[PDB]
């Protein structure tokens, strides 16, 4: 679906409302903003490979712009000039204080709020790569991913906001509908992730 069909469907299923059209757009943007703030991150918010170049003597690497969380089946990889690389390992900061002053290529990291820290402090310019989840407004794609894959969740959320203002009771029905849609979306993500994969112990 697209924005026009979304607005038309939201207006139709809210009681064939016709006067309001701008509030629907406002609460449709706010619905996506609210959904991005919750704990569950769908698969379509995963970014592409991004590389960072940094100066010598700074261990702090700022977090990417729309960082929500990192991707577990992924890693921060140091790409050496020759094209080879190693995967850096995450530990807590307390655990990485032994290394201050030991010298060499970077080998470990910690995330403290807005910054990634490379504790084996490089003495020369480096380059790292990362895969992580991002807010949509910052992805490079053509259309909001949400519109294509999560359209029915969005409709319900918008209808809930609008009705909630009117103080209607119907709102709790649409919140239950949205909760069911998100529950199904989680199972769909799990099924997509695990397809054609065989697990061996050890």
């Amino acid at each position: 679906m697209d924005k026009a069909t979304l607005v038309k469907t939201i207006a139709y299923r809210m009681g064939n409302v016709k006067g309001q059209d701008t509030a629907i757009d406002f609460e449709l943007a706010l619905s996506i903003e609210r959904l991005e703030g919750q704990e569950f991150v769908p698969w379509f918010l995963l970014s592409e490979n991004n590389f960072f170049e940094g100066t010598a003597q700074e261990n702090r690497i700022p977090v990417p712009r729309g960082f929500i969380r990192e991707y577990e089946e992924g890693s921060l990889y140091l790409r050496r000039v020759a094209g080879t690389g190693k995967c850096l390992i995450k530990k807590s900061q307390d655990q990485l204080l032994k290394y201050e002053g030991m010298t060499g290529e970077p080998s470990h990291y910690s995330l403290t709020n807005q910054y990634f820290r490379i504790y084996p402090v490089p003495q020369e310019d480096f380059k790292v790569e990362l895969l992580f989840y991002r807010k949509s407004s910052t992805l490079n794609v053509e259309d909001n991913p949400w519109y294509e894959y999560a359209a029915e969740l969005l409709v319900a959320e918008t209808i809930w906001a609008m009705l909630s203002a009117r103080r209607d009771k119907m709102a709790d029905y649409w919140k239950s509908v949205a909760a069911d849609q998100m529950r199904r979306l989680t199972i769909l993500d799990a099924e997509r992730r695990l397809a054609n994969q065989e697990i061996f112990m050890g």
Binding site: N50, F51, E53, P62, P64, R65
Partner: peptide, 19 residues
């Protein structure tokens, strides 16, 4: 600050096995 992104895979279409 300095994060950059990779250019997309240029070849883009799968074909089909006919009936």
């Amino acid at each position: 600050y300095d994060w950059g992104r990779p250019v997309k895979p240029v070849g883009s279409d799968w074909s089909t096995d006919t009936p």
